[PDB]
Amino acid sequence: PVWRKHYITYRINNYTPDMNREDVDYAIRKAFQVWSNVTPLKFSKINTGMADILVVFARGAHGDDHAFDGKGGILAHAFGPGSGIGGDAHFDEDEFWTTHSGGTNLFLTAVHEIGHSLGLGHSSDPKAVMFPTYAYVDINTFRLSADDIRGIQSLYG
Ligand SMILES: COc1ccc(-c2ccc(Sc3ccccc3[C@H](CCC(=O)O)C(=O)O)cc2)cc1
Ligand SMILES: [Ca+2]
Ligand SMILES: [Ca+2]
Ligand SMILES: [Ca+2]
Ligand SMILES: [Zn+2]
Numbered sequence: 786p787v788w789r790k791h792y793i794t795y796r797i798n799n800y801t802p803d804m805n806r807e808d809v810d811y812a813i814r815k816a817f818q819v820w821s822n823v824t825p826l827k828f829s830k831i832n833t834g835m836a837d838i839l840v841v842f843a844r845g846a847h848g849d850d851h852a853f854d855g856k857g858g859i860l861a862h863a864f865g866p867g868s869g870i871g872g873d874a875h876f877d878e879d880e881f882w883t884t885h886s887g888g889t890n891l892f893l894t895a896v897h898e899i900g901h902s903l904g905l906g907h908s909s910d911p912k913a914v915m916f917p918t919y920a921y922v923d924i925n926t927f928r929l930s931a932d933d934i935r936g937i938q939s940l941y942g
């Protein structure tokens with residue numbers, strides 16, 4: 786499935802204590818911008834009511850039958866487009882979420898997870914943001930790969 790509308794809302798359910806709130810907000814907002822910059826999708830943050838994409842920070846078992854695993858390993862996960870838990874993006878609180886160095890970069894991970902929230906799978910290109918393995922890349926030069934663009938535009942272009 787894909788989202789069958791182009792105005793998509795998100796809501797931050799709770800904040801990781803790893804980062805200042807402003808920096809969580811900014812990383813998430815910029816991550817959505819990565820995908821709206823190459824599609825007709827528009828994303829809006831809401832602060833009450835039910836959003837399409839709920840952003841959650843949780844550790845271990847957190848009520849969706851896909852428990853996290855402590856620091857390392859699975860860093861986050863997200864559900865594909867749909868009602869309810871569909872679209873929601875969960876970040877493992879046992880990671881150390883960061884803006885610049887150390888830990889696991891929240892912006893880069895959110896770009897990957899929102900990709901899943903929108904319906905993308907994984908890429909075989911190590912340069913793709915949808916590559917299955919996280920690695921820190923220079924955020925100043927960050928750019929979707931041709932494969933990422935092809936994938937998202939096949940769904941929403
Ligand atoms: C800059 O380029 C980047 C490239 C990749 C990433 C990146 C990759 C992976 C995760 S999370 C993860 C880690 C290990 C196994 C499984 C998962 C879940 C699936 C979990 C499940 O299936 O239960 C998933 O792939 O979303 C987060 C971020 C980020 C940036
Ligand atoms: Ca983990
Ligand atoms: Ca949802
Ligand atoms: Ca943490
Ligand atoms: Zn979850």
Ligand SMILES: [Zn+2]
Nearest residue numbers: 897901907917
């Ligand atoms: Zn993934």
